[PDB]
């Protein structure tokens, strides 16, 4: 559970926003890509795993689950690649609420940025610092340090 | 000291590798860019500060220190922007040694990757996981969790 992440893909302005959620904290990383391909997904996971100790990734759809390029990055980075079936239906609801919250923040910042990728990084920043009380950024560090100790 | 980072710029294969070092742990993030500009620097810092609690950044040279774009990102993200003068001459030597270590790792992985940007992320992953026995990934989480508590 300190090591479990969920991928999530959402669309805006004709482009794709790929998000990884650390399940136990609500903390996120995200990027803007022109389209979701196994190569883009695999590179994003390699970046994520070099920065946090990623043990398991629930993929966002069957295409990235199937993709041999995604599986080769997970092999390289020591990640267990799993499906994203919401056996717990609460997962579905949490992800959709998170997407709407991100789109809301992106909309509140959109006119401060020329490029969508700046607005998305502004939205990552505000989401991870938001105190709900601790922030998601605080929670992920606490959860992982507790587990290292 | 949990909030202090140092930027560092090194070159390889005709391109630029921008690195942020978390000073107290040795942990790093890095990206490949075609040239170091104020806009590329500012975007890299906005990404970094959405992911870790960045209080201070020592810029890597006087052009990024000067750059009004870099200053605007530091303002947006709540980062105190500082110069990079090594009043402690040990700073120069630690950085030069880290660049030579990264380039050595990049050369050991270089033929597993078509693009330099993959070889660089593979070197970030190996640097941050390497046990010296704690890794730099372990040390940054512990330092920051201690400070949160």
């Amino acid at each position: 559970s300190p090591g479990i992440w969920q991928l999530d893909c959402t669309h805006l302005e004709g482009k794709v926003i790929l998000v990884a959620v650390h399940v136990a904290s609500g903390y996120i990383e995200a990027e803007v890509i022109p389209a979701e391909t196994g190569q883009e997904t695999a590179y994003f996971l390699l970046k994520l795993a070099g920065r946090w100790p990623v043990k398991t990734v629930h993929t966002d759809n069957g295409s990235n689950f199937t993709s041999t390029t995604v599986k080769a990055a997970c092999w390289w980075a020591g990640i267990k690649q799993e499906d994203g079936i919401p056996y717990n239906p609460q997962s579905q609801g949490v992800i959709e609420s998170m997407n709407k919250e991100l789109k809301k923040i992106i909309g509140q910042v959109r006119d401060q940025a020329e490029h969508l990728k700046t607005a998305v990084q502004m939205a990552v920043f505000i989401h991870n610092h938001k105190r709900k009380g601790y922030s998601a950024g605080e929670r992920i560090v606490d959860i992982i340090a507790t587990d290292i100790q | 000291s949990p909030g202090i980072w140092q930027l560092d710029c090194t070159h390889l294969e005709g391109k630029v590798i921008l690195v942020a070092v978390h000073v107290a742990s040795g942990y790093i993030e890095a990206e490949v860019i075609p040239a170091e500009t104020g806009q590329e620097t500012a975007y890299f810092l906005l990404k970094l500060a959405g992911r870790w609690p960045v209080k201070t950044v020592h810029t890597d040279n006087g052009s990024n220190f000067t750059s009004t774009t870099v200053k605007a990102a530091c303002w947006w993200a709540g980062i105190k922007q500082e110069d990079g003068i090594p009043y402690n001459p040990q700073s120069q030597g630690v950085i030069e040694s880290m660049n030579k270590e990264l380039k050595k790792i990049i050369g050991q992985v270089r033929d597993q990757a078509e693009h330099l940007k993959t070889a660089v992320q593979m070197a970030v992953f190996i640097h941050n996981h390497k046990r010296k026995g704690y890794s730099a990934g372990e040390r940054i989480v512990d330092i920051i969790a201690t400070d949160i508590q």
Partner: peptide, 8 residues
């Protein structure tokens, strides 16, 4: 090509 990022 037998690269992680280009398996072809």
């Amino acid at each position: 090509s037998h690269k992680i990022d280009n398996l072809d």
